[PDB]
Amino acid sequence: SKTEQVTGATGITQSTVTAPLPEAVSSLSLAPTVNALDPWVYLNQTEVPGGTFTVSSATQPGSVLLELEISPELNLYTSHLFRMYAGWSGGFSLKLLVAGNAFSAGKLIAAIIPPNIEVPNSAYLLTGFPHEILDFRTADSMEIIAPDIKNIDYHFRGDKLGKLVVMVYSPLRSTSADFEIEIKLTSAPLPDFKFTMLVPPI
Amino acid sequence: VTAPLPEAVSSLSLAPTVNALDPWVYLNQTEVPGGTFTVSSATQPGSVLLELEISPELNLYTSHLFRMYAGWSGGFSLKLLVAGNAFSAGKLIAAIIPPNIEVPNSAYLLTGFPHEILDFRTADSMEIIAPDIKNIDYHFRGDKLGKLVVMVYSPLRSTSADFEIEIKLTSAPLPDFKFTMLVPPIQNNALPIWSIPQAPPYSMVNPRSPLTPVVELYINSSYATCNHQLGRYTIYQGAIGNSTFNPSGAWTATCTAEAGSVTGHPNWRYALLDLPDNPTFDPTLPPVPRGFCDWGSGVKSGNKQHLVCFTGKKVEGGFQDVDTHMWDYGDNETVGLDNTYQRTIYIKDPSLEKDAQYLVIPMGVSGAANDDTVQVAPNCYGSWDYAPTVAPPLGEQFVWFRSQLPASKTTTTSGVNSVPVNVNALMSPDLMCSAYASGFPLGKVALLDYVLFGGSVVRQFKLYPEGYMTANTTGSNTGFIIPADGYFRFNSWVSPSFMISSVVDLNL
Amino acid sequence: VTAPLPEAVSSLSLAPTVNALDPWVYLNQTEVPGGTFTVSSATQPGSVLLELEISPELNLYTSHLFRMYAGWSGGFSLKLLVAGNAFSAGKLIAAIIPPNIEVPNSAYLLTGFPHEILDFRTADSMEIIAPDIKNIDYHFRGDKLGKLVVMVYSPLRSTSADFEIEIKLTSAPLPDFKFTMLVPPIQNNALPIWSIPQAPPYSMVNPRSPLTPVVELYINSSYATCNHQLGRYTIYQGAIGNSTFNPSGAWTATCTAEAGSVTGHPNWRYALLDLPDNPTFDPTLPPVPRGFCDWGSGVKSGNKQHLVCFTGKKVEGGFQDVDTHMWDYGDNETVGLDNTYQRTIYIKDPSLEKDAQYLVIPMGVSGAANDDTVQVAPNCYGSWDYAPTVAPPLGEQFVWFRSQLPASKTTTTSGVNSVPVNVNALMSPDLMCSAYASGFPLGKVALLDYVLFGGSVVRQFKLYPEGYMTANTTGSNTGFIIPADGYFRFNSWVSPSFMISSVVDLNL
Amino acid sequence: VTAPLPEAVSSLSLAPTVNALDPWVYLNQTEVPGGTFTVSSATQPGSVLLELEISPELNLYTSHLFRMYAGWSGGFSLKLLVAGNAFSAGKLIAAIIPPNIEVPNSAYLLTGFPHEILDFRTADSMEIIAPDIKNIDYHFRGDKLGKLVVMVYSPLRSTSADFEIEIKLTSAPLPDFKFTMLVPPIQNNALPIWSIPQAPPYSMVNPRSPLTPVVELYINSSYATCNHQLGRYTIYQGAIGNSTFNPS
């Protein structure tokens, strides 16, 4: 899905909904109990903890600006809820908010790294993974349907989890203001997210 | 529009086996290896920016897959990513080039071939199909192949901000692409990736100055050209000119020490260098011992520039009375041989016997000679194929392994006193060793990352196949240095004309 | 019979994407990397000859394919090839061990597992199915996997010919094999093939004697152990002990020339070596400069064994009055320090000033020293993880890199007169440089072919990961040599106990 | 097993004429010219013992037929005959190399190619199919062709008798073999048979001593080399050095 809007007169703003990797819902047939969530949780995006990161022209080109495990820790409420449960399963929805200016030059790239896979160090290689591309001077946001990569019915604590990587695709060369372009994410669990095996909250 | 020329599918009825591909390979678009370039206001019209031959090397996965197979067939679909802006003016146009049909050197004769154009201002990607052109059922290794050439539909006139535009290409094989005739995965085609070992430069050897560890990397705008003959290595040929893979082992040499003197306040005498690899002094082989010496003392000097070498008298078992003596190439008075590769040399041993083998160890340099004189190298003329001069592209500075040469002096009558000096080497064999295993894609350059402070600073360098490194600079300096922390890292393949985004300011 | 344990096909329901394979891969059988071993009457009973994890590493094509994907699932079909003759009596047993099950140590017990027994005389190939025993939908890298174990069921009692029997394996994936999650093809796993550069040994550097080209390969049955600390490189840890990748650069060092003297017909004075890498003399770091010197003059010889080092006095800019002097390690009389790595050393300079920096070059040896004395290095004491001593397996001998050291003498009062000697090196970094690019499969050894006269004569050596080469010898000699023509070639991966077919006769 | 690589039958659509073969040729197996070699424990590892181009030269009848035609197309069926005994330990590998592919130098690698492995003790004949790998409708003289390569897979370690083993090959064209373009039978290719005249040596001239009839054949272990310049003739260059065809 993609929607476009005019911006005050000169320029356009694009909002897209990408799903680069086909999510595979787990039947959860092996979970002793399936615990639902408060429906209002799914409808509340929140800042991603540690999702505040920065890059610049001087930044190591091709260096991951952000690595985030797709886990309950992404959202405030799921992180709090997870303390009352033993296992979990489901993907997440993520939105991108970056801090540039009129002289921050290039393009952005985001990709999903399966678990246990080494993270590359060059935009050239990152294109191998499923990915997406953007503009830098934008005021709009892009949404990613991050799937939950697993080979088991549900996760216990301590598993290995997939990552999301964001990185500069066409490095800075305008260097007029020469400022640091911080980054900001928001996320919320997907509708199929579930918990299991209520346990005392410690 | 997006399909300027429909593809002519081959039945493949004549192939012993048709090997299908993983279907998901078709649906994912990846960056084209070596399909990156930049255009600036300084680029000339009619200049070729990118030249690729339609083959499995246009995609990461097909390139890796191709090492298993002996044949292939099919075209490719190409997207074009342009990081343009609102102020830039101009356009590009490229033509699919059937094999043996040439491209016009002008922007009028290109619209004929299935092509397409876009505005530099577009934020989206324009798709062009590059079909496979053949007169046979399928390709083997080593045939003619069509090419894709990128040309300027209109040069940059914007100059309201005067900055570059970066272009990148992504490709995916067409649905009719196929392989055939599985074979063991060892082939001569270049790998799409060149994972390098983490060896810091100070751990490498200095071809032009063994026994002196590499201490730093040097950039000097003054050194606009290189004529050295020792630290010359090439991907395709390996060692070039008078180079060797064991510089320390071949550092020493011997001379016959023939009689005859020349004018000078002290007494100088001639000598001829032995050529074990060239027993007959024919003009079609190198005239000097392999990997011997190229200090390049000076153009003309008899009392102010001299080379200091350890010398000894040959005897049974080894040599005797090894001491330090002054020496130089050719003959000072004569022209055309004062600074050239040959056998005649000087000696500072009045008691030098006739037709006696003598040891020579280049070692220290003495007198006014300095690292800039060291950058000068003795001239080579002959049928011995001395390497052609190599220079950084204009707007770029050659990268060298700097070294420190300690001086040698004497309080007694030892004979000679030397002076401190620095030595520059174009390339080190240790870095080039890994490349030989994985060849470079034809007509492409390697973009490397130099991590210094644990991932806090980067110096981006271009490593050309000829065996030299270059960087992008703006200032003007003669003593810019970089630490030797090391950890070279591979980034990607780029065209020779690609301009490095990162810029090193020499004024600081 | 061929399928004792049925294979269970996974539904792959949790896999985001299922990537199929080229159908023709299933129909071709290739050799199993590292799936070679030998057996003879000397083999101990109950010893596991082979142990392979059931993974995509069992087949050439799958191994190369696996570099693209993140997960896999499916079993394999295996065949065993035996090279026995009519006089071979005995039997073999091959079994499949599920994960988390300890392997017993008696053929009697292995029969419980799904197994298959074959005779040594069989000329055909016995086929065995190896299913994928997994607890999960599919596999990621680093899981616990089932194993295939081969061990002697009935010992070789014929002992008629008493010759080695060689076993090889081939494999092909089962029809249900699958991959998943296409990813860029870059991994840290060792490649199944290790194509080597065609660099002859004489083109390589000698770690223990730079400036002296390697002249030949040396085999000596007397040298049953190696305790060197310079030419030590390991595949899994790079340089070991005091080794370095640029031996020429680190050849020189310096000493402070502290006051004090020891008894002797001449006058000897102490000096402490500088430790730039170890500014504080802590016990957990090397006590000598990296890659400095390991001549090993002698166990106890003050008036007979001496080392000659070029020595000069430190001054501004450089050094003054460089000349040859005799030196050794520590004080001869004292035990535990007469021949050991440490800062204290002898000097043959009576006019040696207090606490003055001086230059040292390992240079050569003098006195009554010979090759045997130089071979043994000084003892190492402390807790600075020095390189341990190693020995070859019974029936094999080391292969060394030989070099010739010319002697230096004087007709005047220079002070010293060195003697000709040869230097042996366990390994050369140039050869090991390629191996780092293509790692070694875990628990395996590389079998190399050495071609000398354009293919007419070929030798075979085993290159252990510890960093030494061994050859199978039958005679007894102390001066066997081999030409340095070169052109090393990689053959295949073999077990550490593999017996080389080719035998070098030392009696000729 | 016997057909690792399937054979593709060409349509022969571009052939002006398709000339069939005598059907009984397909049913007879003849020795492969030059398809003989020996192997022993002294054989160096990794050395290619044999290398044959897949062409009409592999069979006697086809070779003679080929002198009539300009083009051909089709594969061959091959058999290997080994003359080992019960004391021979080792194995052989035979592989098919497609055109423009370099032959490796390690049995470990050859297993990638469509191959077949046989033991030295086997008394029967191992059959292998050698298809015609071509990029074109049919073949003219002088093309690049696929190859058959035979090399030692496992060395002879028995060394009990230490005797030579002799290997021979036989071949017959596959049912889809075809010819084209009948032409007069004259070619410069070497004939598979070299029937020699029954001329005794004493009836021949001595280049280094005319007027003296050859009286006997001589063998001397001392003469380890020859540097003569008169009695030197080579098949590919005729007389060499100062030699001549009329020494007298």
What's the 3-state SS for A20-77?
A: CCCCCCCCCCCCCCCECCCHHHHCCCEECCCCCEEECCCCCCCCCCEEEECCHHHCHH
Alpha carbon distance D195, D177 (integer Å): 29
- Across the interface, of A122, A130, A133, the residue whose CB is closest to B492 is A122
* B-chain residues near D74 (CB < 8 A): none
Alpha carbon distance C57, C51 (integer Å): 13
Alpha carbon distance B124, B80 (integer Å): 8
Q: How many CB atoms lie within 10 A of CB B156?
A: 19
Q: Tokens for C230?
A: 């310079």
For residue D93, what are the CA distances in angstroms to A187, B180, B186, C445? 60, 23, 19, 23
Alpha carbon distance B4, B74 (integer Å): 16
Which DSSP category does B175 fall into?
Answer: T
- CA of A150: which chain C residue's CA is closest? C14
Resolution (A): 3.0
Amino acid at the residue B312: G
Alpha carbon distance B458, B455 (integer Å): 8
Closest CA to B468 of B302, B234, B240: B234
Q: Tokens for B178?
A: 């196929």
Helices vs. strands in chain D: H and E counts, helices first = 2, 12
What value does the CA radius of gyration of chain B take, rounded to a whole number of Å?
Answer: 28
How distant is the Cα of B507 from the closest Cα of chain A, in angstroms? 17
Alpha carbon distance C421, B245 (integer Å): 25
Method: cryo-EM
* B-chain residues near C210 (CB < 8 A): 210-211, 248-249
For residue B32, what are the CA distances in angstroms to A168, B48, B177, B321, C381? 18, 17, 17, 63, 56
Closest CA to C360 of C274, C298, C290: C274
CA neighbours closer than 13 Å in the CB half-sphere of residue B395: 9
| Residue D98 near residue D62 (C-beta atoms within 8 A) | no
Q: Between chain C and chain D, how many beta carbons pairs sit less than 8 Å apart? A: 84
Which DSSP category does A155 fall into?
Answer: B
Q: Tokens for A51?
A: 């999702």
* B-chain residues near D93 (CB < 8 A): none
* D-chain residues near C86 (CB < 8 A): 86-87, 121
Closest CA to C478 of C364, C375, C369, C365: C375
To which H or E segment does residue B80 belong?
strand B76-82
Which residues have C-beta within 8 Å of that of residue B489, sequence separation ≥ 6? A121, B196, B448, B449, B450, B451
- Across the interface, of C24, C319, C406, the residue whose CB is closest to B19 is C24
H helix intervals, C215-302: none
Alpha carbon distance C353, C369 (integer Å): 29
Polymer length of chain C: 508
| Residue C307 near residue C423 (C-beta atoms within 8 A) | no
DSSP assignment of C166-201: EEEEEEEE-TT-EEE----S---SPPS--------G
Q: Tokens for C384?
A: 């600075």
Closest CA to C354 of C270, C264, C265, C280: C270
Q: Between chain A and chain C, how many beta carbons pairs sit less than 8 Å apart? A: 54
Residue whose tokens read 């990152």:
A126
Q: Which residues of chain A approach chain B closer than 8 Å at the C-beta?
A: 57-58, 60-63, 105-107, 121-125, 127-128, 130, 133, 135, 169-174
* B-chain residues near D110 (CB < 8 A): 184
Alpha carbon distance C261, C269 (integer Å): 4
Residue A13's DSSP bridge partners are A5
Q: Which residues in D131-195 belong to E strands, given as ranges? A: 147-154, 165-173, 178-180
Alpha carbon distance C289, C230 (integer Å): 11
Alpha carbon distance C478, C470 (integer Å): 15
CA dihedral B219, B222, B227, B231 (to 10 degrees): -20
Q: How do strand C305-314 and strand B468-472 relate by DSSP bridges?
A: unpaired
Alpha carbon distance C39, C36 (integer Å): 10
Amino acid at the residue D41: S
CB contact under 8 A, D111 and C166: no
Alpha carbon distance C161, D85 (integer Å): 15
Q: Tokens for B285?
A: 């082989």
Q: Tokens for B425?
A: 């080497």
* B-chain residues near C420 (CB < 8 A): 317-318
H helix intervals, B28-160: 60-65
How distant is the Cα of B146 from the closest Cα of chain C, in angstroms? 27
Reduce the DSSP state of residue C233 to 3 states and report it: strand
Which residues have C-beta within 8 Å of that of residue C275, sequence separation ≥ 6? C281, C286, C287, C288, C289, C343
Amino acid at the residue C477: N
Alpha carbon distance D39, D152 (integer Å): 9
Q: How do strand A142-146 and strand A92-98 relate by DSSP bridges?
A: antiparallel
Polymer length of chain B: 508
Alpha carbon distance C3, C114 (integer Å): 9
Tell me which of A2, A124, A133 to substitute to probe the interface with B (most B C-beta atoms closer than 10 Å): A124
- Across the interface, of B81, B460, B492, the residue whose CB is closest to A124 is B492
What value does the CA radius of gyration of chain A take, rounded to a whole number of Å?
Answer: 18
CB contact under 8 A, B136 and D137: no
Closest CA to C430 of C248, C229, C220: C248
Q: How many CB atoms lie within 10 A of CB C391?
A: 12
